[PDB]
Design a binder for this molecule. Structure first.
Ligand SMILES: Cc1nnc2c(N)cc(C(=O)N3[C@H]4Cc5ccccc5[C@@H]3CNC4=O)cn12
Length: 130
């Protein structure tokens, strides 16, 4: 229905704003664009589901997220991919892992403070009905 499309449109607006706030954070720069296989050689073969903030925006705009839970699955993927690809004790790997975890924690904290749980419940119920 039109009321349901208004719900998903508000969800997209909310998701774009959260994504923009992550994207402008200096700590999260290396998560703003897809990992370039030319600059990071074995990446696209090791990481099966690459995910980054520009692809998250692309997915919002393509109406791929019908709930905040679906969006957060992709945020979790940015974090888990970095933990998998950079698992060593060296400072380089520890820094990207900390930034990846911080990106995921910031997204969850923004949503905890700003997302009305009845709004998410409505999105979940329209999705489950389709
Ligand atoms: C995410 C992630 N997960 N692992 C690594 C990694 N090992 C390196 C990089 C890394 O530093 N960047 C990547 C992605 C990127 C995107 C925007 C701006 C800079 C960068 C830099 C430069 N080029 C790249 O392809 C990122 N990673």
């Amino acid at each position: 229905s039109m009321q349901e499309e208004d719900t998903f449109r508000e969800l997209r607006i909310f998701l774009r704003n959260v994504t923009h706030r992550l994207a402008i954070d200096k700590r999260f720069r290396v998560f703003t664009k897809p990992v370039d296989p030319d600059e990071v050689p074995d990446y696209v073969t090791v990481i099966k589901q690459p995910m980054d903030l520009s692809s998250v925006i692309s997915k919002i705009d393509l109406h791929k997220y019908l709930t905040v839970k679906d969006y957060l699955r992709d945020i979790d993927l940015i974090c888990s991919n970095a933990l998998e690809y950079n698992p060593d004790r060296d400072p380089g790997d520890r820094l990207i892992r900390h930034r990846a975890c911080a990106l995921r924690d910031t997204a969850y904290a923004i949503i905890k403070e700003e997302l009305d749980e009845d709004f998410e419940q409505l999105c979940e119920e329209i999705q489950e009905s389709r």
